[PDB]
């Protein structure tokens with residue numbers, strides 16, 4: 001026995017996680033804490049390894065170092081997954097073998113009283129003959145896994161080893177590395193919560209409080225509630241950025257204003273720095289991105305007709321439905337409308353007003369030149385990442401352009417079709433909601449391919465069809481004069497009006513490119529030219 | 535004793551609850567070996583991988599004295615789509631050959 005029965009995990013680095021320690025100890029290392037005498041009387045072996053999986057950058061290695069330290073073991077021998085890889089035949093195996101030289105020597109010499117060695121892999125998935133299943137060529141010369149297995153156990157027995165692995169894609173691990181007698185204990189490290197964020201922020205700001213250099217104005221609870229779905233490293237980055245900005249401001253002010261030395265020595269970080277850097281410096285991967293909205297909602301939304309209100313209200317009802325309910329952890333909805341009816345903007349809007357923590361937009365714009373397998377990889381990655389939050393809402397910007405449709409033929413990529421059809425019907429991990437929004441301009445084709453059946457609801461987005469609607473929209477935009485408006489109203493009473501908002505904006509901009517004399521006539525001529533009759 | 539291999543097919547209109555009935559009838563058998571092979575676990579695979587997975591499941595199932603193997607949503611496995619038509623031939627042939635193979639004597 002080298003530790004107290006109740007352990008201790010506080011103000012020694014790791015602060016977020018406290019229950020996982022107790023759980024893992026109760027499950028795994030009960031053998032090494034009990035009076036030895038009965039242990040030798042027991043004839044029972046010790047667990048020969050464990051595996052940890054969780055979202056990247058959530059503080060896993062710290063657990064390994066702490067557990068290695070507390071047990072009174074030797075120095076951990078860190079190693080990197082991809083690093084152990086060579087193109088020369090029969091070379092990586094030597095690397096895998098060398099790691100156990102010290103343990104072998106100690107076991108041979110001291111017999112059954114040697115110390116404890118610990119070996120810490122990193123991205124253990126690097127060496128597996130399972131990644132080759134997916135579309136590609138990464139057979140990684142399976143021999144590696146056989147060598148690793150035959151070294152952990154086999155004809156020669158080692159009783160002085162403990163293997164700890166860290167990975168991010170739990171699925172891609174070969175099954176054989178989980179049978180009893182080998183790595184045989186799993187655990188999950190989920191995202192931190194409010195209390196964990198508070199503890200981590202408090203820990204990393206101890207120096208400033210000790211030296212009083214921090215401004216008294218700043219709190220920690222406010223900032224903690226501000227950060228919704230950050231990760232471990234993000235809090236440290238935020239603190240560093242705040243320090244840098246505060247000091248830059250202080251030095252610039254001192255140079256600009258010859259302040260008395262009293263404030264010059266003072267380097268108070270103040271509170272403005274924290275918020276400024278938070279909104280301008282750090283961009284969490286798992287959090288909301290306020291930036292992307294502007295890239296699609298470029299001109300806001302102006303209420304020009306009743307349908308907008310109906311659509312927004314229905315979106316609100318769907319959001320309410322997905323938030324609080326059971327028996328339906330997954331929901332779907334599809335938007336359809338003629339070309340240039342501004343479907344995308346509505347989707348982005350409704351997603352924004354959803355007010356969910358995790359929101360992401362995946363459009364074909366960031367995938368040009370990709371072969372289909374890459375598209376499957378992207379879809380899978382984004383959905384898998386979205387599965388790691390309590391709530392989530394994803395937006396598939398343009399379903400049609402994803403499939404590579406073209407009326408001639410017809411032609412498309414079947415593989416993407418399957419991937420989407422299967423994915424739209426997979427419940428998240430237990431106790432987690434979701435919301436998926438589509439978009440398209442070709443309803444009939446989707447109806448024909450049986451995919452419309454998978455979606456669970458539909459909404460319609462019509463166009464401008466009435467003259468008075470056009471007058472009201474023009475007035476809202478505010479680009480035409482009173483007598484000019486009268487002329488337009490006089491000439492547009494025919495009611496044969498059917499146009500899309502995007503086209504209307506472009507047409508107005510074009511018509512505003514000559515002298516005031518001829519604007520009305522040119523605009524009317526161009527509008528008359530586009531006499532659509534759906 | 536003289537019919538070691540049996541088969542059965544469920545079918546109905548969509549949303550009629552077939553998967554649930556299949557799973558329930560499988561559970562109520564009290565056989566020692568059960569295994570469900572669904573399309574949800576092979577997203578984005580290549581057909582060769584699907585064939586290998588099918589072969590592995592059936593090989594493992596052979597070893598025991600009893601068993602009950604369930605294949606769910608045949609059409610999705612084949613990757614059917616009414617336009618065309620288009621689908622995978624390899625999966626179809628593998629499944630069809632498998633579905634009439636006897637295990638080793640007395641199983």
Ligand SMILES: Nc1ncnc2c1ncn2[C@@H]1O[C@H](COP(=O)(O)OP(=O)(O)OP(=O)(O)O)[C@@H](O)[C@H]1O
Nearest residue numbers: 298299300301302339340341342343344345501502
């Ligand atoms: N109330 C509104 N309704 C629709 N669009 C609006 C509205 N107000 C402004 N817009 C502008 O309409 C455009 C909408 O872009 P969007 O991509 O949705 O159009 P689209 O051509 O119909 O779609 P897509 O090409 O993606 O199929 C943006 O410029 C947006 O600024």
Ligand SMILES: Nc1ncnc2c1ncn2[C@@H]1O[C@H](COP(=O)(O)OP(=O)(O)OP(=O)(O)O)[C@@H](O)[C@H]1O
Nearest residue numbers: 425546547548549550551552553554555556606607
């Ligand atoms: N008698 C019943 N038959 C079928 N499902 C039932 C029955 N009673 C309740 N259910 C519920 O129905 C749901 C089963 O629906 P399920 O998704 O299996 O339908 P399906 O038509 O077989 O699916 P799919 O065609 O999408 O593969 C479960 O919630 C189950 O609890």
Ligand SMILES: Nc1ncnc2c1ncn2[C@@H]1O[C@H](COP(=O)(O)OP(=O)(O)O)[C@@H](O)[C@H]1O
Nearest residue numbers: 013014015016056057058059060061062232233
């Ligand atoms: N629970 C935690 N408490 C304190 N710091 C943490 C915690 N989790 C992550 N960190 C921060 O993350 C950094 C190390 O991250 P690391 O352990 O390498 O992530 P991973 O284990 O996922 O690779 C440290 O600088 C540390 O400040």
